[PDB]
């Protein structure tokens, strides 16, 4: 939620992974 909203497939998505890590915490 900043700028640029490209669909992508094998790039930006990666960043999304981090958004899923927000919960991931040893």
Swiss-Prot record:
One of its GO terms (biological process) is defense response to bacterium. Keywords: Antibiotic, Antimicrobial, Bacteriocin. Active plantaricin A is composed of an alpha chain and a beta chain. The beta chain sequence is shown. This heat stable bacteriocin inhibits the growth of closely related Lactobacillus species. It may act as a pore-forming protein, creating a channel in the cell membrane through a 'barrel stave' mechanism. This is Bacteriocin plantaricin-A. It comes from Lactiplantibacillus plantarum (strain ATCC BAA-793 / NCIMB 8826 / WCFS1) (Lactobacillus plantarum). The lineage of its organism: Bacteria, Bacillati, Bacillota, Bacilli, Lactobacillales. The gene is plnA.
């Amino acid at each position: 939620k900043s700028s640029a909203y490209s669909l992508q497939m094998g790039a930006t998505a990666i960043k999304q992974v981090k958004k899923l890590f927000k919960k991931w915490g040893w």
